[PDB]
Design a protein around this ligand. Structure first.
Ligand SMILES: [Zn+2]
Lengths: 141, 116
């Protein structure tokens, strides 16, 4: 079975790296220098490095040449055991379902639990249930 | 191919049968490639929001399903190369899942993730 290798990357750029790699593979697949990579895993919970699937280290070493994003993680290629070939794909509870409880960060109701009512298909705004905390305009000027 | 690769990161959905992650424009224009005759997705937007759901996490660069352990684990070996996911939360209504079994299409839950 193929092996899974690890390569360092910048913090906050994981989907961009994935799409760039996809574009490079699609653009350099009918040439004399194809990429032997099988697949790359970019979990959402992790942020700071990405994974890559390949048999040998030379494959990914020669496959990440020229890219300016993976330059940092180019002089070291770590190998993980075979037991770690299934925990990377695990996800602990996406996270968008009506009639569920969610919390807020900005606004005035900071660090408070709420409840979802309706979701707009436009993916721009979503309703929310919460009890008001204002003073009803009696204390403020 | 260049038609399955996502164009813009914003506004991206994912299927529930084969977990095909692409951009909304491609879904409206191209639609599900691995399952089109049995899904009837091209040429409308309502069905896209009906079956596909944006509630999904995880991205994988599938390029050789025939020779890959991840494809075997996810049961996506008989699909075309593309950008898939590893956990798509959702379930089709009780009006479209019925005809899949009648036409010889086994409906399986791709939400490999655990709950609590
Ligand atoms: Zn699908």
């Amino acid at each position: 079975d193929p092996n899974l290798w690890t390569v360092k990357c910048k913090i906050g750029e994981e989907r961009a790296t994935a799409i760039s790699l996809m574009r490079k593979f699609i653009a350099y697949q009918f040439t004399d220098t194809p990429l032997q990579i099988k697949s790359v895993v970019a979990p959402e919970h992790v942020k700071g490095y990405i994974y890559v699937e390949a048999y040998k280290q030379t494959h990914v070493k020669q496959a990440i040449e020229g890219v300016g994003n993976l330059r940092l993680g180019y002089w070291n290629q770590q190998m993980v055991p075979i037991k770690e070939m299934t925990d990377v794909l695990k996800v602990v509870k996406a996270n968008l379902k009506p009639k569920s409880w969610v919390r807020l960060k900005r606004g005035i109701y900071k660090d408070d639990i709420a409840q979802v009512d309706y979701v707009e298909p436009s993916q721009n705004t979503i309703s929310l249930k919460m009890i008001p905390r204002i003073d009803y305009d009696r204390i403020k000027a | 191919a260049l038609e399955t690769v996502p164009k813009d990161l914003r506004h991206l959905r994912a299927c529930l049968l084969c977990s095909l992650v692409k951009t909304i424009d491609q879904f409206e224009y191209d639609g599900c490639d691995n399952c089109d005759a049995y899904l009837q997705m091209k040429g409308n937007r309502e069905m896209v929001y009906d079956c596909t759901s944006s509630s999904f996490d995880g991205i994988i660069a599938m390029m050789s399903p025939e020779d890959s352990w991840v494809s075997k684990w996810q049961r996506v070996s008989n699909f075309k190369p593309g950008v898939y996911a590893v956990s798509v939360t959702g379930r089709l209504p009780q009006g479209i899942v019925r005809e899949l079994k009648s036409r010889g299409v086994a409906y399986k839950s791709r939400d490999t993730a655990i709950k609590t």
